[PDB]
Protein backbone atom coordinates (compact mmCIF):
# COMPACT_ATOMS: atom_id res chain seq x y z
CA UNK A 1 0.00 0.00 0.00
CA UNK A 2 2.43 2.78 1.16
CA UNK A 3 5.28 4.49 -0.69
CA UNK A 4 7.29 7.67 -1.15
CA UNK A 5 5.88 10.25 -3.62
CA UNK A 6 8.59 12.91 -3.34
CA UNK A 7 11.43 14.07 -1.07
CA UNK A 8 11.96 17.88 -1.01
CA UNK A 9 15.13 19.30 0.53
CA UNK A 10 14.42 21.74 3.39
CA UNK A 11 17.95 22.43 4.68
CA UNK A 12 21.35 20.87 3.92
CA UNK A 13 24.33 21.07 6.22
CA UNK A 14 27.76 19.53 5.70
CA UNK A 15 26.74 16.38 7.67
CA UNK A 16 22.94 16.30 8.13
CA UNK A 17 19.95 17.42 6.09
CA UNK A 18 16.28 17.85 6.74
CA UNK A 19 13.74 16.82 4.08
CA UNK A 20 10.00 17.17 3.52
CA UNK A 21 8.79 13.68 2.58
CA UNK A 22 5.53 13.24 0.71
CA UNK A 23 4.01 9.82 0.80
CA UNK A 24 0.92 7.77 0.09
CA UNK A 25 -0.95 6.52 3.13
CA UNK A 26 -2.83 3.23 2.99
CA UNK A 27 -6.28 4.88 2.54
CA UNK A 28 -4.95 6.29 -0.82
CA UNK A 29 -4.45 9.73 0.76
CA UNK A 30 -1.29 11.91 0.28
CA UNK A 31 0.58 12.98 3.52
CA UNK A 32 3.90 14.58 4.53
CA UNK A 33 6.62 14.00 7.10
CA UNK A 34 9.73 15.76 8.25
CA UNK A 35 12.72 13.42 7.68
CA UNK A 36 16.37 13.60 8.66
CA UNK A 37 19.18 12.11 6.66
CA UNK A 38 22.94 12.17 6.67
CA UNK A 39 24.83 13.70 3.72
CA UNK A 40 27.59 11.10 3.97
CA UNK A 41 25.88 7.92 2.65
CA UNK A 42 27.28 6.75 -0.67
CA UNK A 43 26.96 3.08 -1.78
CA UNK A 44 27.31 1.61 1.78
CA UNK A 45 24.61 -0.81 2.84
CA UNK A 46 24.23 1.49 5.85
CA UNK A 47 25.56 4.71 7.34
CA UNK A 48 27.51 3.07 10.12
CA UNK A 49 28.38 0.16 12.29
CA UNK A 50 28.09 -0.52 15.98
CA UNK A 51 30.30 -3.19 17.49
CA UNK A 52 29.23 -5.66 20.22
CA UNK A 53 32.72 -6.57 21.48
CA UNK A 54 32.87 -9.63 23.76
CA UNK A 55 36.11 -9.66 25.56
CA UNK A 56 37.07 -13.25 26.41
CA UNK A 57 39.92 -14.05 28.84
CA UNK A 58 40.76 -17.34 30.52
CA UNK A 59 39.40 -17.46 34.11
CA UNK A 60 37.62 -14.08 33.62
CA UNK A 61 33.92 -13.63 33.19
CA UNK A 62 33.18 -12.37 29.59
CA UNK A 63 32.98 -8.56 29.36
CA UNK A 64 31.12 -6.23 26.97
CA UNK A 65 33.50 -3.46 25.90
CA UNK A 66 31.70 -0.05 25.81
CA UNK A 67 32.88 3.48 25.19
CA UNK A 68 32.16 6.83 26.89
CA UNK A 69 32.29 10.05 24.90
CA UNK A 70 30.97 13.53 24.90
CA UNK A 71 28.16 13.81 22.41
CA UNK A 72 27.39 17.35 21.34
CA UNK A 73 23.70 16.64 20.33
CA UNK A 74 23.07 15.34 23.82
CA UNK A 75 25.01 18.09 25.71
CA UNK A 76 26.76 15.37 27.75
CA UNK A 77 28.59 12.07 28.07
CA UNK A 78 27.08 8.89 26.64
CA UNK A 79 27.88 5.18 27.14
CA UNK A 80 27.70 3.29 23.84
CA UNK A 81 28.87 0.32 21.77
CA UNK A 82 31.96 1.35 19.80
CA UNK A 83 30.77 2.71 16.48
CA UNK A 84 31.51 4.79 13.43
CA UNK A 85 30.56 5.52 9.89
CA UNK A 86 31.49 3.06 7.17
CA UNK A 87 34.13 4.58 4.79
CA UNK A 88 33.33 4.57 1.00
CA UNK A 89 34.23 1.12 -0.35
CA UNK A 90 34.72 -0.31 3.08
CA UNK A 91 32.88 -3.45 4.24
CA UNK A 92 30.72 -3.35 7.46
CA UNK A 93 33.05 -6.02 8.93
CA UNK A 94 36.20 -4.04 8.17
CA UNK A 95 34.59 -0.79 9.48
CA UNK A 96 33.63 -2.65 12.74
CA UNK A 97 37.08 -4.07 13.36
CA UNK A 98 38.71 -0.76 12.41
CA UNK A 99 36.48 1.37 14.64
CA UNK A 100 36.81 -1.09 17.56
CA UNK A 101 40.63 -0.84 17.35
CA UNK A 102 40.64 2.97 16.95
CA UNK A 103 38.19 3.54 19.84
CA UNK A 104 39.40 0.86 22.22
CA UNK A 105 42.79 -0.52 21.24
CA UNK A 106 41.43 -4.03 20.90
CA UNK A 107 41.92 -6.26 17.91
CA UNK A 108 38.85 -8.35 17.50
CA UNK A 109 37.68 -11.35 15.42
CA UNK A 110 34.39 -11.20 13.52
CA UNK A 111 31.59 -13.42 14.87
CA UNK A 112 28.51 -12.12 13.11
CA UNK A 113 27.10 -9.20 11.20
CA UNK A 114 23.52 -8.04 11.09
CA UNK A 115 21.58 -6.75 8.19
CA UNK A 116 21.18 -3.00 8.06
CA UNK A 117 19.01 -1.91 11.00
CA UNK A 118 17.28 1.47 11.55
CA UNK A 119 18.45 3.86 14.26
CA UNK A 120 15.28 5.95 14.75
CA UNK A 121 12.98 5.33 11.84
CA UNK A 122 10.26 7.79 12.80
CA UNK A 123 12.96 10.51 12.61
CA UNK A 124 15.72 9.49 10.16
CA UNK A 125 16.74 7.06 7.51
CA UNK A 126 19.94 6.25 9.44
CA UNK A 127 21.00 2.64 9.53
CA UNK A 128 23.86 0.54 10.89
CA UNK A 129 25.15 -2.96 10.83
CA UNK A 130 25.47 -4.39 14.27
CA UNK A 131 28.66 -6.44 14.24
CA UNK A 132 29.41 -8.93 16.97
CA UNK A 133 33.15 -9.42 17.46
CA UNK A 134 35.08 -11.54 20.02
CA UNK A 135 38.28 -10.16 21.52
CA UNK A 136 40.92 -12.70 22.69
CA UNK A 137 42.13 -10.89 25.77
CA UNK A 138 44.81 -13.64 26.24
CA UNK A 139 46.55 -12.58 22.98
CA UNK A 140 49.60 -10.34 23.61
CA UNK A 141 48.18 -7.94 20.95
CA UNK A 142 45.29 -7.27 23.37
CA UNK A 143 47.36 -7.02 26.54
CA UNK A 144 48.02 -3.27 26.77
CA UNK A 145 45.36 -1.92 24.32
CA UNK A 146 46.04 1.75 23.28
CA UNK A 147 43.09 3.74 21.74
CA UNK A 148 44.07 5.51 18.45
CA UNK A 149 41.29 8.05 18.23
CA UNK A 150 41.24 10.38 15.16
CA UNK A 151 41.17 14.20 15.14
CA UNK A 152 38.64 15.49 17.71
CA UNK A 153 37.94 11.93 19.00
CA UNK A 154 38.14 11.42 22.75
CA UNK A 155 36.96 8.10 24.06
CA UNK A 156 37.11 6.29 27.42
CA UNK A 157 36.88 2.46 27.46
CA UNK A 158 34.59 0.73 29.94
CA UNK A 159 34.37 -3.06 30.13
CA UNK A 160 31.58 -4.56 32.13
CA UNK A 161 30.82 -8.15 32.92
CA UNK A 162 28.20 -9.60 30.68
CA UNK A 163 26.70 -11.54 33.57
CA UNK A 164 25.91 -8.28 35.45
CA UNK A 165 25.71 -5.73 32.67
CA UNK A 166 22.39 -4.02 33.43
CA UNK A 167 23.23 -3.53 37.15
CA UNK A 168 26.62 -2.21 36.28
CA UNK A 169 25.16 0.31 33.82
CA UNK A 170 22.54 1.26 36.52
CA UNK A 171 25.46 1.78 38.92
CA UNK A 172 27.29 4.13 36.55
CA UNK A 173 24.13 6.17 35.85
CA UNK A 174 23.59 6.48 39.60
CA UNK A 175 27.18 7.69 40.36
CA UNK A 176 28.39 9.54 37.22
CA UNK A 177 25.10 10.83 35.75
CA UNK A 178 25.49 10.18 31.99
CA UNK A 179 23.17 8.64 29.36
CA UNK A 180 23.25 4.97 28.32
CA UNK A 181 22.53 4.26 24.67
CA UNK A 182 19.25 2.59 23.89
CA UNK A 183 20.88 -0.38 22.08
CA UNK A 184 23.27 -0.93 24.92
CA UNK A 185 20.34 -0.84 27.33
CA UNK A 186 18.25 -3.15 25.17
CA UNK A 187 21.06 -5.70 25.00
CA UNK A 188 21.53 -5.54 28.81
CA UNK A 189 17.82 -6.00 29.44
CA UNK A 190 17.72 -9.07 27.19
CA UNK A 191 20.77 -10.52 29.03
CA UNK A 192 18.65 -10.19 32.23
CA UNK A 193 15.48 -11.49 30.63
CA UNK A 194 17.03 -14.62 29.04
CA UNK B 1 35.92 18.62 30.69
CA UNK B 2 33.80 19.05 27.50
CA UNK B 3 30.65 21.15 27.34
CA UNK B 4 28.25 23.13 25.16
CA UNK B 5 29.16 26.79 24.52
CA UNK B 6 26.26 27.79 22.24
CA UNK B 7 23.57 26.53 19.91
CA UNK B 8 22.56 28.18 16.64
CA UNK B 9 19.22 27.40 15.02
CA UNK B 10 19.70 26.32 11.35
CA UNK B 11 16.16 25.22 10.46
CA UNK B 12 12.96 24.54 12.43
CA UNK B 13 10.06 22.51 11.07
CA UNK B 14 6.87 21.59 12.85
CA UNK B 15 8.42 18.38 14.29
CA UNK B 16 12.23 18.50 13.92
CA UNK B 17 14.91 21.16 13.94
CA UNK B 18 18.58 21.22 12.90
CA UNK B 19 21.06 23.14 15.04
CA UNK B 20 24.76 23.86 14.88
CA UNK B 21 26.29 23.20 18.27
CA UNK B 22 29.43 24.94 19.45
CA UNK B 23 31.43 22.99 22.07
CA UNK B 24 34.75 22.86 23.83
CA UNK B 25 36.82 19.87 23.00
CA UNK B 26 38.94 18.44 25.81
CA UNK B 27 42.13 20.14 24.50
CA UNK B 28 40.50 23.63 24.96
CA UNK B 29 39.81 23.87 21.21
CA UNK B 30 36.39 25.16 20.12
CA UNK B 31 34.43 22.90 17.68
CA UNK B 32 31.07 22.67 15.94
CA UNK B 33 28.52 19.81 15.47
CA UNK B 34 25.35 19.54 13.42
CA UNK B 35 22.65 18.16 15.76
CA UNK B 36 18.97 17.37 15.35
CA UNK B 37 16.28 17.80 17.98
CA UNK B 38 12.53 17.26 18.13
CA UNK B 39 10.37 20.34 18.67
CA UNK B 40 7.89 18.32 20.78
CA UNK B 41 9.80 17.74 24.02
CA UNK B 42 8.46 19.29 27.33
CA UNK B 43 9.28 15.34 29.90
CA UNK B 44 11.73 12.66 31.13
CA UNK B 45 12.39 11.82 27.49
CA UNK B 46 10.85 12.33 24.06
CA UNK B 47 9.31 8.86 23.89
CA UNK B 48 8.71 5.35 25.16
CA UNK B 49 9.39 2.01 23.54
CA UNK B 50 7.69 -1.08 24.94
CA UNK B 51 9.14 -4.50 25.25
CA UNK B 52 5.85 -6.51 25.34
CA UNK B 53 6.27 -10.02 26.67
CA UNK B 54 3.15 -11.98 25.71
CA UNK B 55 2.67 -14.85 28.13
CA UNK B 56 0.14 -17.60 27.33
CA UNK B 57 0.22 -20.90 29.18
CA UNK B 58 1.27 -23.93 27.09
CA UNK B 59 2.71 -21.60 24.43
CA UNK B 60 6.10 -20.07 23.77
CA UNK B 61 6.57 -16.71 25.31
CA UNK B 62 6.37 -14.11 22.48
CA UNK B 63 7.69 -10.60 22.01
CA UNK B 64 5.07 -8.38 20.43
CA UNK B 65 6.29 -6.10 17.63
CA UNK B 66 4.76 -3.79 15.11
CA UNK B 67 5.32 -3.25 11.38
CA UNK B 68 4.64 0.24 9.94
CA UNK B 69 5.64 2.27 6.90
CA UNK B 70 8.28 4.81 8.01
CA UNK B 71 8.51 7.74 5.69
CA UNK B 72 12.09 8.69 6.63
CA UNK B 73 13.08 5.11 5.80
CA UNK B 74 11.04 4.89 2.56
CA UNK B 75 9.89 1.42 3.64
CA UNK B 76 8.39 -0.86 6.25
CA UNK B 77 10.12 -1.35 9.62
CA UNK B 78 9.72 -3.84 12.43
CA UNK B 79 9.83 -2.14 15.83
CA UNK B 80 8.90 -2.32 19.51
CA UNK B 81 5.55 -0.55 20.06
CA UNK B 82 6.42 3.07 20.75
CA UNK B 83 5.42 6.66 20.88
CA UNK B 84 5.98 10.14 22.29
CA UNK B 85 5.06 10.73 25.90
CA UNK B 86 2.07 13.21 26.23
CA UNK B 87 2.71 16.47 28.21
CA UNK B 88 2.14 15.44 31.84
CA UNK B 89 2.12 11.66 31.11
CA UNK B 90 4.36 9.32 33.05
CA UNK B 91 6.64 6.94 31.01
CA UNK B 92 4.80 3.95 32.47
CA UNK B 93 1.39 5.26 31.43
CA UNK B 94 2.63 6.26 27.98
CA UNK B 95 3.83 2.67 27.58
CA UNK B 96 0.54 1.00 28.47
CA UNK B 97 -1.36 3.50 26.40
CA UNK B 98 0.96 3.16 23.35
CA UNK B 99 0.86 -0.64 23.65
CA UNK B 100 -2.93 -0.64 23.68
CA UNK B 101 -3.26 1.71 20.74
CA UNK B 102 -0.72 -0.04 18.53
CA UNK B 103 -1.41 -3.67 19.54
CA UNK B 104 -4.73 -3.74 21.50
CA UNK B 105 -2.99 -5.59 24.34
CA UNK B 106 -3.50 -4.60 27.98
CA UNK B 107 -0.36 -5.11 29.97
CA UNK B 108 1.40 -4.74 33.27
CA UNK B 109 4.61 -2.84 33.94
CA UNK B 110 7.60 -5.03 34.92
CA UNK B 111 10.34 -2.38 34.89
CA UNK B 112 11.18 1.01 33.30
CA UNK B 113 14.58 2.28 32.14
CA UNK B 114 16.06 5.69 32.74
CA UNK B 115 16.04 7.98 29.69
CA UNK B 116 18.29 6.32 27.01
CA UNK B 117 19.60 7.87 23.84
CA UNK B 118 18.42 6.90 20.38
CA UNK B 119 21.31 8.15 18.18
CA UNK B 120 23.52 10.47 20.25
CA UNK B 121 25.93 11.34 17.37
CA UNK B 122 22.96 12.73 15.44
CA UNK B 123 20.19 13.79 17.81
CA UNK B 124 19.25 14.45 21.39
CA UNK B 125 16.32 12.05 21.19
CA UNK B 126 15.74 9.88 24.19
CA UNK B 127 13.26 7.23 25.34
CA UNK B 128 12.35 5.11 28.30
CA UNK B 129 12.39 1.44 27.47
CA UNK B 130 9.49 -0.11 29.36
CA UNK B 131 9.30 -3.85 29.89
CA UNK B 132 5.68 -4.95 30.06
CA UNK B 133 4.13 -8.41 30.47
CA UNK B 134 0.83 -9.27 28.81
CA UNK B 135 -1.37 -11.93 30.36
CA UNK B 136 -2.50 -13.57 27.17
CA UNK B 137 -4.98 -15.85 28.99
CA UNK B 138 -7.05 -12.88 30.32
CA UNK B 139 -10.32 -12.19 28.54
CA UNK B 140 -9.32 -8.55 27.86
CA UNK B 141 -6.39 -9.82 25.72
CA UNK B 142 -8.41 -12.48 23.91
CA UNK B 143 -9.40 -10.53 20.77
CA UNK B 144 -7.11 -7.52 21.15
CA UNK B 145 -8.50 -4.11 19.91
CA UNK B 146 -5.72 -1.98 18.15
CA UNK B 147 -6.84 1.72 18.50
CA UNK B 148 -4.69 3.67 15.98
CA UNK B 149 -4.40 7.44 16.57
CA UNK B 150 -4.86 9.68 13.48
CA UNK B 151 -2.81 8.48 10.49
CA UNK B 152 -1.28 5.40 12.18
CA UNK B 153 -1.35 2.10 10.29
CA UNK B 154 0.17 -0.72 12.35
CA UNK B 155 0.44 -4.49 11.70
CA UNK B 156 1.16 -6.58 14.78
CA UNK B 157 3.78 -9.34 14.64
CA UNK B 158 4.32 -11.67 17.60
CA UNK B 159 7.43 -13.72 17.62
CA UNK B 160 8.68 -16.43 19.97
CA UNK B 161 11.18 -15.00 22.41
CA UNK B 162 13.45 -18.17 22.35
CA UNK B 163 14.07 -17.96 18.57
CA UNK B 164 13.63 -14.15 18.09
CA UNK B 165 16.89 -13.43 16.21
CA UNK B 166 16.39 -16.28 13.66
CA UNK B 167 12.78 -15.18 13.22
CA UNK B 168 13.70 -11.57 12.51
CA UNK B 169 16.42 -12.59 10.04
CA UNK B 170 13.88 -14.75 8.25
CA UNK B 171 11.49 -11.83 7.93
CA UNK B 172 14.15 -9.48 6.63
CA UNK B 173 15.22 -12.19 4.15
CA UNK B 174 11.74 -12.97 2.92
CA UNK B 175 9.84 -9.65 3.30
CA UNK B 176 12.34 -6.73 2.55
CA UNK B 177 11.68 -5.10 5.93
CA UNK B 178 14.13 -3.18 8.15
CA UNK B 179 14.40 -4.33 11.76
CA UNK B 180 14.91 -1.65 14.42
CA UNK B 181 18.36 -1.54 16.02
CA UNK B 182 16.96 -1.81 19.55
CA UNK B 183 14.86 -4.84 18.59
CA UNK B 184 17.86 -6.46 16.90
CA UNK B 185 20.08 -5.68 19.90
CA UNK B 186 17.64 -7.32 22.32
CA UNK B 187 17.37 -10.35 20.01
CA UNK B 188 21.18 -10.69 19.86
CA UNK B 189 21.53 -10.64 23.65
CA UNK B 190 18.82 -13.31 24.00
CA UNK B 191 21.18 -15.55 21.93
CA UNK B 192 24.42 -14.34 23.49
CA UNK B 193 23.21 -14.99 27.11
CA UNK B 194 25.51 -17.62 28.77
C1 LIG C 1 5.25 11.99 16.53
C2 LIG C 1 4.32 11.42 15.45
C3 LIG C 1 3.38 10.33 15.96
C4 LIG C 1 2.22 10.41 14.96
O1 LIG C 1 2.07 11.79 14.68
C5 LIG C 1 3.30 12.47 14.88
C6 LIG C 1 3.78 13.13 13.56
O2 LIG C 1 2.95 13.46 12.71
N1 LIG C 1 5.18 13.33 13.39
C7 LIG C 1 5.80 13.87 12.31
C8 LIG C 1 7.15 14.07 12.14
N2 LIG C 1 7.42 14.71 10.92
N3 LIG C 1 6.42 14.97 10.21
S1 LIG C 1 4.91 14.47 10.91
C1 LIG D 1 29.78 11.56 10.97
C2 LIG D 1 30.64 11.80 12.20
C3 LIG D 1 31.31 10.52 12.69
C4 LIG D 1 32.81 10.77 12.38
O1 LIG D 1 32.97 12.16 12.47
C5 LIG D 1 31.85 12.72 11.85
C6 LIG D 1 31.62 14.20 12.24
O2 LIG D 1 32.59 14.91 12.56
N1 LIG D 1 30.28 14.67 12.23
C7 LIG D 1 29.86 15.89 12.48
C8 LIG D 1 28.58 16.33 12.50
N2 LIG D 1 28.55 17.70 12.67
N3 LIG D 1 29.64 18.26 12.77
S1 LIG D 1 30.97 17.22 12.69
CL1 LIG E 1 9.78 -10.12 31.71
MG1 LIG F 1 32.53 6.42 17.07
MG1 LIG G 1 35.56 6.41 15.52
MG1 LIG H 1 4.39 4.52 17.48
MG1 LIG I 1 0.29 5.13 18.79
Amino acid sequence: KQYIISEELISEGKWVKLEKTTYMDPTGKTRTWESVKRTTRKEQTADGVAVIPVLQRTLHYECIVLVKQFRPPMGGYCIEFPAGLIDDGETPEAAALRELEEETGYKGDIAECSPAVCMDPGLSNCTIHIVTVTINGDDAENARPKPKPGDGEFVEVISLPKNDLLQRLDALVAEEHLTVDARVYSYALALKHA
Side-chain angles (χ1 to χ4, degrees), chain A residues 1-7 9-41 45-87 89-140 142-143 145 147 149-174 178-194:
Chain A
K1 230 92 123 286
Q2 304 183 70
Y3 56 92
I4 295 303
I5 288 160
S6 73
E7 295 183 274
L9 176 58
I10 303 170
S11 181
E12 174 161 24
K14 179 160 152 61
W15 303 92
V16 191
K17 59 185 173 209
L18 180 40
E19 283 180 0
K20 190 179 179 173
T21 309
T22 297
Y23 70 98
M24 185 65 71
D25 92 6
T27 74
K29 195 226 164 145
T30 273
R31 301 166 166 281
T32 71
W33 199 270
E34 294 178 9
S35 297
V36 181
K37 305 175 147 77
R38 289 172 177 273
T39 61
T40 40
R41 203 150 96 181
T45 47
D47 297 278
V49 291
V51 187
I52 295 175
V54 183
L55 168 68
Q56 303 167 323
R57 267 129 94 217
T58 43
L59 297 182
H60 294 232
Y61 290 106
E62 295 191 328
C63 288
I64 305 300
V65 175
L66 296 175
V67 286
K68 186 188 178 176
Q69 282 171 277
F70 180 84
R71 293 292 203 186
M74 289 293 309
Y77 290 86
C78 288
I79 292 172
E80 305 157 56
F81 290 133
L85 294 201
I86 299 165
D87 288 332
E90 193 176 38
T91 192
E93 299 94 328
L97 296 167
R98 168 184 54 76
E99 290 289 347
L100 175 65
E101 172 183 57
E102 290 176 2
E103 293 196 350
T104 77
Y106 290 119
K107 293 202 190 266
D109 309 289
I110 294 288
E112 43 185 319
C113 181
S114 76
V117 295
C118 47
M119 284 309 284
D120 188 356
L123 185 67
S124 71
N125 72 339
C126 308
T127 59
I128 62 171
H129 302 264
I130 299 170
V131 181
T132 302
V133 165
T134 52
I135 306 158
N136 185 340
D138 300 331
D139 197 279
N142 289 321
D151 182 79
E153 266 208 296
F154 317 93
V155 185
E156 194 205 324
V157 177
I158 293 164
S159 301
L160 295 174
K162 183 178 107 186
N163 66 12
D164 203 27
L165 180 59
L166 176 52
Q167 290 194 241
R168 296 287 297 275
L169 291 164
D170 287 345
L172 292 165
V173 157
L178 43 289
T179 308
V180 175
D181 182 92
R183 292 152 293 161
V184 176
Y185 204 90
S186 299
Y187 190 88
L189 274 168
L191 291 172
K192 194 189 159 169
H193 302 341

